[PDB]
Design a protein around this nucleic acid. Sequence first.
DNA 1: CATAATTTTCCCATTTCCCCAACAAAAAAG
DNA 2: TTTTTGTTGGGGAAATGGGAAAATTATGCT
Lengths: 280, 280
Amino acid sequence: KLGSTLRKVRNGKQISICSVADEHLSKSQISRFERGESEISCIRLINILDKLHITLDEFLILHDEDYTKTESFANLVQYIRKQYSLQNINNIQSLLSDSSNYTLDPFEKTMVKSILHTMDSSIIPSDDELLQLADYLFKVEKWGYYEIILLGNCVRTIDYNSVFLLTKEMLNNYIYSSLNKTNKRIVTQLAINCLILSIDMEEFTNCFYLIDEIKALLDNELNFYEQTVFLYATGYFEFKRWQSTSGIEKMKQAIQVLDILGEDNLKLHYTIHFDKLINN
Amino acid sequence: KLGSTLRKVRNGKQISICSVADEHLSKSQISRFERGESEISCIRLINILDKLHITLDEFLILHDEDYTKTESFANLVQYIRKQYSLQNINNIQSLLSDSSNYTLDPFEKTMVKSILHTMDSSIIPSDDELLQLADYLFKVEKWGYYEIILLGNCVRTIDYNSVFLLTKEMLNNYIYSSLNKTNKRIVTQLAINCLILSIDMEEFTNCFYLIDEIKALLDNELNFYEQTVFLYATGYFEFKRWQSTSGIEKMKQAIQVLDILGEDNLKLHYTIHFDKLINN
DNA sequence: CATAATTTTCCCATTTCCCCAACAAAAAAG
DNA sequence: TTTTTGTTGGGGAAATGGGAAAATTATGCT
């Protein structure tokens, strides 16, 4: 089913079958594959794509732009992003029902329940399903998008100690490629949220460790949003610890960035937090 | 050659061949493929990966962690970025020589020559080759990483109007998704640099267009670096156009962000620019 | 207009892959 | 023994590679 869009891509680049053919694939097989008549192995498909100067990510994206993007987990988080952004609780809660067309696996149900916990405190993930998701994450080899998102939304639902331990493992086991730092950016955001939660719990050794780790992640990475929330994180850290004038200075500076960059909502939430810190 | 790392992945998630076996692929074929004995079509490999909760990029990244990467345009820009950061002019220029173990295609040579132009004014791409790369980009269908990087690194070498036209075409033809917001970030950076060059040439209608377009790209995209350079861009815009009191404030706000976070050198570049503008 | 280019596609040699079974084989059920 | 998993063959089915028609485009010149 892929070959059709290979034809589309090839003709858009005004390249002939004769050109993309090489010692690795005969012209006839390209003709057949592009016509949905036969299927070629992934290795040779990558070879042909490289001839055309297009990534497999780019090609599969163009191919999913036509046809359909079926139940993936990528489309699941996409859908939850759209609903949560709109604040449609009864649209997300429906993913747990029987009649749902998006199907959730146990860990997916745990993650959705934990996301719904922020929209409604009454929606609580069971102690057992949470310990099962922790069981899974503790026995991971290399962390992909899947495991990252699973941990990321349950940072405040699973036991703290478990959360920090899993964060430490994630930092030194997740899949990363320089040409796509999406996983890296999400990991940095998760680490910073774990840092905020660590200052909440007053475990300053975990705080120091995560501050160094986040520093490393941020280094020569133009993720100024993460840098800003991390500046506020270091401020919260130094305030909880000693009530440092440099910490409150950093916390003020972060809201100042959120002001210059007209990010109204971020500035507002990080102002209301600072208010509770200075009121009490 | 792929199957081996699939085995690794499968063994890391501690799931059996019987588990990933389904209506689409027999167990024996998985055994053989993982043993480097037979090859499955990309569709079936995608299916097996989907069962294992891993992207095809994630999987190919793990596969490239071992073995070796056939040096491509992706790895070429990887290398040139690393060298440019370190300021190794002769290490970049060596890519054009006989002795280079990267064989650069004509447009790749044009891009490298243009990268060397910023490091040395004497290195200028010929009038012919720049028009050759422009001709290529003008007859592109969908803009992938290749075409985007080619334009982005030649924004100041090809004809201004040609560059702006190619930018306008790129904004409405590039490949974009969600599991990879990389290309969108690069496109936003390119648009903002085209905006700076548009204020340089004083084509304020092009500026207006790019301001709206960049606005659209940035919306609820936490690219505070792009937002900062765009705030300074709008400041330069309003200053050159009207000598606006609001524009100098915007430029000051952007330099303020670059200081507040602590990106020293960015602060230096955008300070030297503001200094020359307020001096003259 | 007609003819001459390329791009493409249609059939058939053989190689290779693949589902169905039977085994081979370590576990973690009893 | 009790579900389980990793690795083998054999009829069958595809997927390939190499040649010629047929659809599509570029031009033959008076």
